[PDB]
Amino acid sequence: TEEQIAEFKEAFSLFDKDGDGTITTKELGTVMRSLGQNPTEAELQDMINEVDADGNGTIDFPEFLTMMARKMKDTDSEEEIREAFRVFDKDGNGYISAAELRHVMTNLGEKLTDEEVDEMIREADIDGDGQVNYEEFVQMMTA
Amino acid sequence: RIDVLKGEKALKASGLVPEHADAFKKIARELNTYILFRPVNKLATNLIKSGVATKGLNVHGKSSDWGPVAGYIPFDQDLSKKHGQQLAVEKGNLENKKSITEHEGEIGKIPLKLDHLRIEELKENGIILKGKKEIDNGKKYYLLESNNQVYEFRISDENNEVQYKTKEGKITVLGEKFNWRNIEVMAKNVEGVLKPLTADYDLFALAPSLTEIKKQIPQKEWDKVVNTPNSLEKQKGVTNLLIKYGIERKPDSTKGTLSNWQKQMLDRLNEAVKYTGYTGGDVVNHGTEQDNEEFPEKDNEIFIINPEGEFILTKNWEMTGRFIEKNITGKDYLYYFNRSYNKIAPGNKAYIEWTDPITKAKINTIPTSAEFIKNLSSIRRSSSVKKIAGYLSDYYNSANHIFSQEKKRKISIFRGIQAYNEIENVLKSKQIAPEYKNYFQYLKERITNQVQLLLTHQKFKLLYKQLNFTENETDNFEVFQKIID
Ligand SMILES: Nc1ccccc1C(=O)O[C@H]1C[C@H](n2cnc3c(N)ncnc32)O[C@@H]1COP(=O)(O)OP(=O)(O)OP(=O)(O)O
Ligand SMILES: [Ca+2]
Ligand SMILES: [Ca+2]
Ligand SMILES: [Yb+3]
């Protein structure tokens, strides 16, 4: 959107000791991950190895603002996910708890031992509160 | 205990043809899924029943609820229920003016005819009474009176067409005045002929039982994930199935934005009434309100048929929401509320509030990285350390699931004070924009409650006095370790 396109441009100027929005691929990942991504050293290659045949190895806004202008498609599910989270949060405390995750599961068909479940909360828990908040429930479903 | 209506008194207040609301009990039970309907022009009911074609989504003119044309959809929207208000009665016609041209052939307009029977139906509801006779150039007209001041109507004896004109003295909302002219109603094409349109059954929300959704997922794609060694790639694949098969909806050609179980659940409904006899075709033409994000309507009374065939009727939003909290969203059903509810809808600029749990907590959780940046985005609508954006990208480090809770709490609580620090000195430098200065006074607070929370979960500023801002490495970390014990 206008705002989206107004964001990729925002953070882009957070780290560029060049000034003219002319960054490097050495820091391109530092830009995509800080803004919500986790690409591999390979994904940086093939992509940048098509539009940037300049040989300079530098990047600007118009360039970057078009690359994400593709990936940012099937990923936009953000919504569905957020609505999904709210489905689990049966109590509406803002966090998904074992007891809750149990229901969502048993009622879906897959029964789980009070053990296996408490495992899913822990492998999904990133801050130890023993519960998953949207922020978390997001990573667990994105990265 | 919440003061809602039930059974008969509820159905009556709804608008749905009785036979139909009954036919719906079935499907509500058969699929254990709550059916929630939006109001329905009461003057439309008897029309629906007699078999009038309800209006699809390609027609947006409002139905009238007064005068002789009550129940139908007047072409001159000033005869609609929005009578009297301009920007509305105006944005109305334009809509009609479009349905007639951009759908040439599919939708048209025709003269209103009140047959001998309907007239009575109206004399009963006390909407219009057949008055004295009148002759105009060899034509017998019977006047039709209403308690309305601007317009005056009458009906012909030959073909039963109704006409209206402005009353000597008054002026249309749009500022007009005219003399005797046919009242035109929005019609639809059926077998080459034009048939009038009445209200349609607008669905507020559809919420089925979580199990009912399972049936949707193919017992093949399910197992594939149900049987995954690891646990993580499992939850993801699990949830993602709930998404893909129950939560997600896409735009359809004429049903607006809906999902698939909805398309079926929808279709079953229209069929269900065709069985009782409604010959006018469908009677539910578009997806549920919660998917209407451009022109959201906030109705006081909502009609609810529960999976037990019972009848309810929320007395008002606050309550409509209370009922959805205690019987649907907190009882293991599939439910999602419109995405524009606590935002300004773009279409009509509406601002419909709704209780969103994810936000309630917002205050007690520290911000991710995007939220930070994207907040520096929508923050620069009024109007250099990328460390705070990193420390924030560190806190939610997926590569955290190998450590133990005890561990997690530590590095995080630390990663918090680490981010809460690189923020303190940014403020200790230039008050940049008065409003940015606030955002941070805010984060600093969210950072607190979160950090503090992790500590009380296990063992604030107190500890912020003893620590190294000064050099930089793991050395700073080392001092920390001990402190927590
Ligand atoms: N276009 C303009 C003029 C006036 C008001 C709004 C708009 C109008 O375009 O916006 C419309 C679109 C929207 N809507 C309802 N279910 C939908 C579904 N899930 N998907 C998409 N949209 C849905 O609702 C608005 C009108 O809905 P409708 O169902 O055509 O008539 P309704 O509200 O029942 O009028 P009545 O029967 O009372 O005379
Ligand atoms: Ca919860
Ligand atoms: Ca957690
Ligand atoms: Yb409709």
CATH number given to A75-143: 1.10.238.10
The method of structure determination was X-ray
Give the whole-angstrom CA distance, residue B282 versus residue A66.
45
Maximal C-alpha separation, chain B: 106
Q: Which stretch of DSSP H or E encloses residue B204? A: strand B203-208
Residue B283: how many CB atoms within 10 A of its CB? 22
Give the whole-angstrom CA distance, residue B43 versus residue B59.
18
Contact, B414 vs B477, CB < 8 A?
A: yes
Q: Tell the CATH superfamily of the A14-74 domain.
A: EF-hand (1.10.238.10)
Give the whole-angstrom CA distance, residue A29 versus residue A41.
8
- Judged by a CB distance cut-off of 8 A, whether residue A87 touches chain B is yes
Q: Is B465 exposed, middle or buried (0-12, 13-18, 19+ CB in 10 A)?
A: exposed
Provide the b/e sequence for B183-204 (b: ≥16 CB within 10 Å). Answer: bbbbbbeeeeebbbbbbbbbbb
For chain B, the structural domain boundaries read 1-40+200-335, 41-199, 355-485
Nearest to A10, CA basis, from B478, B381, B312 = B381
What are the angstrom distances between the C-alpha of A31 and each of A14, B261, B370, B386, B393?
9, 40, 11, 10, 11
Q: At what angle do helices B387-395 and B405-427 cross, to 10 degrees?
A: 160
Nearest to A123, CA basis, from B145, B408, B385, B100 = B408
| Ligand 2 center to B357 CA (angstroms) | 10
Q: Which stretch of DSSP H or E encloses residue B321? A: helix B317-327
Spell out which residues line ligand 1, taking CB within 6 angstroms. Answer: B 41, 57, 60, 62-63, 91, 95, 199, 202, 256-257, 286-289, 291-292, 295
φ/ψ region of B256 (left if φ > 0, alpha if ψ in -120 to 50, else beta) reads: left
Give the whole-angstrom CA distance, residue B425 versus residue B416.
15
- Judged by a CB distance cut-off of 8 A, whether residue A64 touches chain B is no
| Ligand 2 center to B227 CA (angstroms) | 25
User: Do A10 and B377 lie within an 8 Å CB cutoff?
Assistant: yes
Give the whole-angstrom CA distance, residue B65 versus residue B91.
18
Neighbouring residues of B117: CB distance < 8 A, sequence distance ≥ 6? none
Can you name the CATH fold of B355-485? Butyryl-CoA Dehydrogenase, subunit A; domain 3 (1.20.140)
User: Do A107 and B210 lie within an 8 Å CB cutoff?
Assistant: yes
Neighbouring residues of A129: CB distance < 8 A, sequence distance ≥ 6? A95, B453, B454, B457
Tokens for A9?
A: 């441009």
Residue B143 CA, chain-centre distance (Å), reads 42
Which residue among B20, B60, B83, B457 is the active-site one?
Answer: B60
Q: Which stretch of DSSP H or E encloses residue B42? A: helix B42-49
B41-199 matches B355-485 in fold:
no
Report chain A's terminal Cα–Cα distance, integer Å. Answer: 23
Give the whole-angstrom CA distance, residue B125 versus residue A52.
74
Nearest to B81, CA basis, from B57, B101, B97, B61 = B61
Residue that is written with structure tokens 């990663």 in the block: B415
Q: Is B410 exposed, middle or buried (0-12, 13-18, 19+ CB in 10 A)?
A: buried
CA torsion, points B231, B232, B235, B239, in degrees to nearest 10?
A: -160
Q: Phi first, then psi: what are they for B6, rounded to 5°?
A: -160, 160
Tokens for A103?
A: 């229901």
Q: Does domain B41-199 have CATH number 3.40.50.300?
A: no
The response to whether A58 counts as a known ligand-binding position is yes
Contact, A90 vs B330, CB < 8 A?
A: yes
* Helix spans in B349-404 (H): 357-362, 369-377, 387-395
Give the whole-angstrom CA distance, residue B107 versus residue B285.
15
- Judged by a CB distance cut-off of 8 A, whether residue A104 touches chain B is yes
Residue that is written with structure tokens 């759908």 in the block: B103
| Ligand 3 center to B367 CA (angstroms) | 13
Residue among B398, B406, B413 with most chain A CBs within 10 A, to mutate: B398
B20 is catalytic: no
> Pick from A10, A128, A143: which is nearest to B376 by CB?
A10
Contact, B77 vs B61, CB < 8 A?
A: yes
The response to whether A134 counts as a known ligand-binding position is no
Neighbouring residues of A111: CB distance < 8 A, sequence distance ≥ 6? A105
Nearest to B278, CA basis, from B64, B30, B22, B65 = B22
Within chain A, all domains assigned CATH 1.10.238.10 are found at 14-74, 75-143
Residue B481 C-beta-side C-alpha neighbours within 13 Å: 6
